[PDB]
Amino acid sequence: AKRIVEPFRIKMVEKIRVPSREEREAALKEAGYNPFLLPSSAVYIDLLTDSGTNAMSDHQWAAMITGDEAYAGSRNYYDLKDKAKELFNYDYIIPAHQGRGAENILFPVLLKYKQKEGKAKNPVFISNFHFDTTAAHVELNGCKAINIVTEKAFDSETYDDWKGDFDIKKLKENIAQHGADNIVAIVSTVTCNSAGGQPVSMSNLKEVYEIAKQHGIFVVMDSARFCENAYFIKARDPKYKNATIKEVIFDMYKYADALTMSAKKDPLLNIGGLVAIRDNEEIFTLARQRCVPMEGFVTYGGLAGRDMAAMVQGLEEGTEEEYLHYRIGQVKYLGDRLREAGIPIQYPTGGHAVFVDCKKLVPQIPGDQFPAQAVINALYLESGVRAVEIGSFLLGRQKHADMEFMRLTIARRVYTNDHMDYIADALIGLKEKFATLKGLEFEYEPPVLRHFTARLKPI
Amino acid sequence: AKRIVEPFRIKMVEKIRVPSREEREAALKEAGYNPFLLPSSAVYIDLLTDSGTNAMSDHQWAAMITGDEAYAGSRNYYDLKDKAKELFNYDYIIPAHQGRGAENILFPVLLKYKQKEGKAKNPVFISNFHFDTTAAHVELNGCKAINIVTEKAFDSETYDDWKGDFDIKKLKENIAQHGADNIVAIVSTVTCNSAGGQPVSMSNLKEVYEIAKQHGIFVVMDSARFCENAYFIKARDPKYKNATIKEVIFDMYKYADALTMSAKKDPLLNIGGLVAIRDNEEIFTLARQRCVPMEGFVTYGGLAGRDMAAMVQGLEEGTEEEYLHYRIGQVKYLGDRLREAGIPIQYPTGGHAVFVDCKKLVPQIPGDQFPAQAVINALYLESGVRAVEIGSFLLGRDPATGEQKHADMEFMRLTIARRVYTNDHMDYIADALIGLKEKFATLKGLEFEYEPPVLRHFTARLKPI
Amino acid sequence: AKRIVEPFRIKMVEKIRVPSREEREAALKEAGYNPFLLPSSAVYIDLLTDSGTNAMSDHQWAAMITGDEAYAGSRNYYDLKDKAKELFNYDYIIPAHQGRGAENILFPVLLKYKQKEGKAKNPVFISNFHFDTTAAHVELNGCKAINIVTEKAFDSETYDDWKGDFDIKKLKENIAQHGADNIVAIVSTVTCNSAGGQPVSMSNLKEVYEIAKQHGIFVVMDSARFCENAYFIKARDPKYKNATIKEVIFDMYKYADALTMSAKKDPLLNIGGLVAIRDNEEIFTLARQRCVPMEGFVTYGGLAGRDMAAMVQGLEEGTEEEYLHYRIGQVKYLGDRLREAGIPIQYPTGGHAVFVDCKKLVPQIPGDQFPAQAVINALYLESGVRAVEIGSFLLGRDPATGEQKHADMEFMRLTIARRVYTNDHMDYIADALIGLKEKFATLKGLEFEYEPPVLRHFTARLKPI
Amino acid sequence: AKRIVEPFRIKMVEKIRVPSREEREAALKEAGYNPFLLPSSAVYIDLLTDSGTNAMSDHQWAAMITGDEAYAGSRNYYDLKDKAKELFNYDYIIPAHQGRGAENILFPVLLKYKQKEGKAKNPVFISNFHFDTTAAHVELNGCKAINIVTEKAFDSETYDDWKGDFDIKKLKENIAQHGADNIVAIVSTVTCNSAGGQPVSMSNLKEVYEIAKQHGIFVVMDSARFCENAYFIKARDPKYKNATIKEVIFDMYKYADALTMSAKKDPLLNIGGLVAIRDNEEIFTLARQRCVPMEGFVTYGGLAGRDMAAMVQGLEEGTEEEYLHYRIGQVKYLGDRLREAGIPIQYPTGGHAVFVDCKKLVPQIPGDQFPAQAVINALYLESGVRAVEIGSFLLGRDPATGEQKHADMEFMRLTIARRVYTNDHMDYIADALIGLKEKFATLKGLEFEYEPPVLRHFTARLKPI
Ligand SMILES: C=C(/N=C/c1c(COP(=O)(O)O)cnc(C)c1O)C(=O)O
Ligand SMILES: C=C(/N=C/c1c(COP(=O)(O)O)cnc(C)c1O)C(=O)O
Ligand SMILES: C=C(/N=C/c1c(COP(=O)(O)O)cnc(C)c1O)C(=O)O
Ligand SMILES: C=C(/N=C/c1c(COP(=O)(O)O)cnc(C)c1O)C(=O)O
Ligand SMILES: c1ccc2[nH]cnc2c1
Ligand SMILES: c1ccc2[nH]cnc2c1
Ligand SMILES: c1ccc2[nH]cnc2c1
Ligand SMILES: c1ccc2[nH]cnc2c1
Ligand SMILES: c1ccc2[nH]cnc2c1
Ligand SMILES: [Cl-]
Ligand SMILES: [K+]
Ligand SMILES: [K+]
Ligand SMILES: [K+]
Ligand SMILES: [K+]
């Protein structure tokens, strides 16, 4: 395992504390054995998500302080529009308060657009893998969310360069089965969060887009972790060995018609989202009409001016290769600590998190008992580390998936490699108990995005 | 007119500038004679809205710096829950990114909740006056938005204590006509923004709530400007002359079952919203289920932790009587400068804005040529001040005929952000409008260069005639 | 009286409050009847000083956030060096933590420099008027501080354009009497704080410098309020009617060899100072050698990097004519409110404060009973406004006699921080002082309960008579 | 070597960069082969000092935002006074802009106090080891600075628990030689910076103070790194094994009469200093009288209010044992990386820096050719890391002879700012120095191009040989 030094130094700290074992047991009981319902005061190192927990730079805070809070025509709106043109070559933007706000703006518009001419009676979205909010918005609008990630993603220990790729054979099969007139959009998720933060190759994005254009299908790039994807393309595709990260990004967005983005990920923010559209003015106009009631007026989109300002700066910082090398290298370091100790993980590690394969760590659990959640809860009790489940629990409707990950999710520029060692050493310490204590049931199950507020029972 | 001194001093400033007349003429032309299309760089004093443009305190900024950005279980979420219990006596909260986010969380839930009982067959919402976003959410969910403000609100020049009140007679006529089965909720808007920021009396809130309950009707308090409403109750209702602002607020919320709030108004924020529910845990659970896909996880609701932190502090600051007296007194000062010069306004002034009645200023301009927009544009060209139209332009066309809907009032709204502008800025505004008195009679009406089929007020491009 | 609108809007506020009358009486007694010993919690509007109490801009706070805290070679040091070259055409800088630190760096070096040449046998400094800290440093180094302001400054009610001017006849007389060999430096104080914030004309600065150069005498510009001085030159000297403020500043600094600056004044800071030297590298090197033990390493001079960053930005903002017009216009407004009501002031008002002439206002209180302090204390008890004395109390006792020094000027200074208070705060101050019209006669003097052997106005305790 | 995890997480970052070898070559030549003259833009990891380069907490920044900038009576002054009473049990405070400002306030006052008693005819100060600014103020006031650290400090490789201790035999010998009447004060430096950041035991502080009291000698605690010293006492003195850090601090300050503090060290600030006096009100009063001309008014002492606020919070954070364990553990980690690779260091490592013994690394370079500076320059060219010399270059010339003063130790100090760098930064530092092991034997010394007569290490220009 190799430690890579921060390409920055620390300018402001935030205190953390280790709650006592008694506190942790009490807190997990009070939370119904669901870490989503734990208070932050009961958590030491928080690995629930890399979303919105990032550390900003002094330049981002400075941008916030001079942000323009105007209701209409904020300076920072125009700066953000210019930044989207620079990075993606897209001519239209709509800010949103975060990624699922961007989805709520755009997906219903794309559906109604497709329903023109009386077609799309059996509407579907197709993705390498829809994230949970993404699929929820697809289904809330009466559509099916189809996932067709490469089968290589399902072999955790076997290395592959591009475990986020679309399965192209399945893309063509689904077009033939459903018909192009029923495919509202193809969603290219970069990196592929559900597969383990695994990258999509440039050739895969390109072929998917060429197929989509053959059939007149609109392509949306789900862009929360687009810079991590671009880094992997530079690292693993020899064609881009000597390209800049921004050159890689520019090419990626040749292979979509629009993007939805949670800027709470790679743009290094605590809040913020974005819709950008390459050149379809009609869809832009319709999306603006939905933005107004759902998010806010179209030049702030549910964001304070200071957050548009932070986003303009964060979009730049998130592309910096030295930063990306360190960030992705820290995730790799945590994974290598675990793998060298015999802990099974999705290999190679993705951009933002280490995905621990609990199907191999705890094969004696079925999806009936959510294997990765029993691991997560045991780790929390042992160490005060909070992680999150990316398996049957999150996928929804006991529908068992093809992956049962515990996601040790790593915020950007927050934790050191000594925090990583603490995480790894704590889990490595659980090895005599992975068989003892095990299993979980439901008490309360929401019908949509159940994992966030459900209460569970062990056995 | 009386100037009331600030109960604070200035700690940080932001430069503003007056573009040259040549630059203002070019900018208005480029914006299609629609100030909503102007960049902020072309605006000197911005009176488009009081929403999200407020100046925060040093304590609010300090709260932001120590805010907890945890995705689940932020320290500031629990502080916000405790604050809602303190102020409103409500037991459940869901943060939202702003007021229309709170509406999107709660209103669909209220409709489905009533549909589930075999009711809401032909559903409606009733308010003293639904704000634009509020009505849009009512209509997006297949319901009609019925507004029944007191008739006193339509006599602009005649003083009344409570121009935001519900018309109780119309409330009963609408209940008889639609039946309680079809009334998804009553929305008590405090202050009543669309009537001119005018207050709703305590006795009116109470009587509306009593009628609603006797009919099984859920009541939502639209609370963006709840502190300004509380101030007017203390100022004008003898029974509350010696009450604290917080005591007034506590009584107000005895007369709703829940609240939706834009915290971009009275809680002195640049972003933020809130749903609070008094004690109906089922509705709270259903609203949480909608919050997750639309806004965010239920302990941040689409806000950064720093903004929940700022909201907890701003909720306190927005109740402070010395601040409210100064804030509402500044609005009154602007109004009295205008009224004393013969400019007709909605009288008395409300909490957050002066509404200028443009019918009388430009009688050569009929309603379908947007008299208030012509005055706003002349004001901008004269001074760099940007105001907003609450008249025929905003009102739109009648779907049945395609013709301009008859505007009951043609208002220019001079909307005042909190703790941002001084009374010398107010004088600049008033002097600019007063100085146009001779020009009013020769202002030209407006027609459409480009009219969108919806939301024309925001993006339509206009031409002088 | 004319109110001039702010060329900015408020972005962050800070609460203030009025202590009750009972609290003000108790507080003044505990402070030994010296407002310098009052806590800020006992003060409503604080007019003790314009030093370090200014409101910064969002750009200044942004500059602080990205400031370089390096001990050696901070980015912001080089930015500050460039800014001094831009504004003054001076090639060398040494930051200092504030103005009296700059004086402590430079004045002992100028003395030693004059001595190493075999001169300065009986050394003196000459100024239009040395500020208190400035004179203290002159005297701590064994020199006499000679003040030779124009006699026009002593006629408070009679308007003059340049009440801060040197008396040129007295300058020549003092050089002839003491000898050029004994004049360590001439200090041109701009504006002339002790005369009432009153400007020095360009022609006066030039003549003083020309005389100095003919004699080989070094000239230091005491530059705390250099932008206010530049504004008055543009306003009152027809030669500069169409010059920019920066053009005026550039010309001013042709008439010194170095500057000492409290950046807590016109550069709009809460802390900060500066030495700049035009081109004498030997004096620069010697000043750096004193900086190291007294202030800090030579690239931060006792300041955090963020404060050098704020100074770079504030130096720019402090030169902006729109801001200066408003700032000086607010001081003028307070002065005109008072003068129109018959209160005697130093007329015209200076840049930063209204100086109320208390010899005229309370002639029944002898100088050694501190007439201006009796007014100040009386104003504080009546209103919670804290002002400061610039008269006998500040002046102290004569060493040769042990008795009170006779003062030419007996001012109560209403000192105005920059961008902090509105003109409605000014009205509060004026109305409070005007309301004391009838009590002015009954005002007692005061007597000492304990007197510092030196620095009595900062730490002494008083009792009424 | 053992890595200790941060008891915090990162909330804000600042970009750093490795200049190219070409850039480093050009920058070092321009800086005259003296890293003190490098711009920070030429430095990758800056180990010049732990003074003022620390990372603050969100709570410290929040305290700054609400800081009271009042010239007299700031809220934060009273908070700081209370904090000094809590931590030290001292009843009087004077803020200062930084540590050498506190020295400038207090040391001249202690001399005058001893002189007016008829004493101090041939005055000296005695310390375990005076830091260079501290000795400079002693000498500037006409006194001799006597250093009497334990001889154990000069055996770098041999462990000892208390390498900062006073040599008690030498203390009694110096009292006998000079006489108590001539000893103005004893200065207890904690930790002993010049000995390698090495701690002073509680029993040593106590015996020194008991000896001082026997003879009527005033004791000052130089307290820049008092929390690091307290940590070492808890770690190494069994009497305090179960004491809190604050309990250790409280006992330490039973053994002084006053303190001078650079708050740019253990209180985790970028600027700030402090004088505190236990109970001698006369010395407090005299110190206040010097504060006014040199630093500022007595309730801010040359600091912005926001910096007094940050100091109140940092004083608390600097005592937290979990933080001290990590901070001191990081320094020990760097030291163990070096020592495990055969690089000689002062062992055990102290609180704030690793001191590399270059007398052992480059024996072929004599002291007057600055062996430690040769190592420092090689490290900079190899890696972009800037370190500082604590050896013959710093020590300077004997004023009697004009030749090199003999250095008892030739240290390269790798000084670590608090909460700024990670242990992976430490690995970069260590790997860079370890990779030079074969180059050391052929490094050449340095000679002068420009040499100040007083403090040549801060500004001298050198050339290789
Ligand atoms: C919350 C995270 N994900 C959000 C996300 C979203 C939704 O973004 P917001 O959380 O900003 O609504 C959309 N698309 C992808 C690929 C995502 O990963 C997370 O992975 O924890
Ligand atoms: C934008 C403003 N109003 C918002 C508003 C809203 C919507 O809040 P947001 O703008 O925070 O979505 C809801 N209810 C009332 C009574 C309102 O006044 C405005 O009046 O300009
Ligand atoms: C403190 C103020 N004056 C400071 C000052 C100083 C001393 O600056 P500091 O207060 O920053 O040390 C020097 N020269 C002049 C002309 C000054 O006005 C005051 O006028 O209240
Ligand atoms: C600058 C550091 N030392 C400052 C210092 C000082 C002087 O403090 P200021 O740098 O804050 O003036 C006084 N006493 C001790 C023991 C010190 O270590 C340093 O060690 O690099
Ligand atoms: C894991 C954790 C939090 C999330 N919020 C949205 N999707 C998520 C996945
Ligand atoms: C197997 C194959 C290729 C790999 N690249 C990195 N680790 C690997 C393991
Ligand atoms: C005026 C100003 C802003 C608005 N946002 C929504 N409706 C509005 C009316
Ligand atoms: C008046 C006010 C503040 C001062 N600081 C130093 N001298 C002063 C005189
Ligand atoms: C090394 C580094 C910085 C210093 N400041 C004062 N003496 C020093 C020695
Ligand atoms: Cl109906
Ligand atoms: K967040
Ligand atoms: K806003
Ligand atoms: K200050
Ligand atoms: K610093």
Numbering used by the authors:
A (entry chain A): 2 to 398, 405 to 466
B (entry chain B), C (entry chain D), D (entry chain C): 2 to 466
The authors write:
Tryptophan indole lyase (TIL, EC 4.1.99.1) is a pyridoxal-5′-phosphate (PLP)-dependent enzyme that catalyzes the reversible cleavage of L-tryptophan to indole and ammonium pyruvate (eq 1). The reaction mechanism of TIL is of interest since it catalyzes the β-elimination of a carbon–carbon bond with a formally poor leaving group, indole. The functional assembly of TIL, and the asymmetric unit, is a homotetramer. The active site is formed in a dimer at the interface of two monomers.
